[PDB]
Amino acid sequence: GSSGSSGKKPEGKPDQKFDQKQELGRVIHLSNLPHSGYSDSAVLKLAEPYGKIKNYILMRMKSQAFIEMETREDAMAMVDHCLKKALWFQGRCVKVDLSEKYKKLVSGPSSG
Known about the structure:
It is built from two helices and six strands; from the N terminus they run βαββαβββ. It has a single domain, classed as RRM (RNA recognition motif) domain (Alpha-Beta Plaits, 2-Layer Sandwich). The protein has helices at 41-44, 72-84, and strands spanning 27-31, 53-59, 64-69, 88-89, 92-93, 95-98. It comes from Mus musculus (Mouse).
């Protein structure tokens, strides 16, 4: 018949975080790239000397690329080096930046 409680009883113990700065946003932007039909490793090896890479997106349109670094210090060091001496690749001068838009790189939207 009736009961003062559900058949689903209590179990486990709660462990949920309130608030933490677990990570910061870090994606390198590359523009004015060469056009020679190269493998993705050719672009990735521009960022490999400065730190570890998580994710990337190449764009043939206007010859651009995006690269997610493991750390924001590893990313900012690539920008600082380019500001001191400009990056050259396959005989083209590369526009090196760090994106305010891109916190990380993911295929498709974050929604379901």
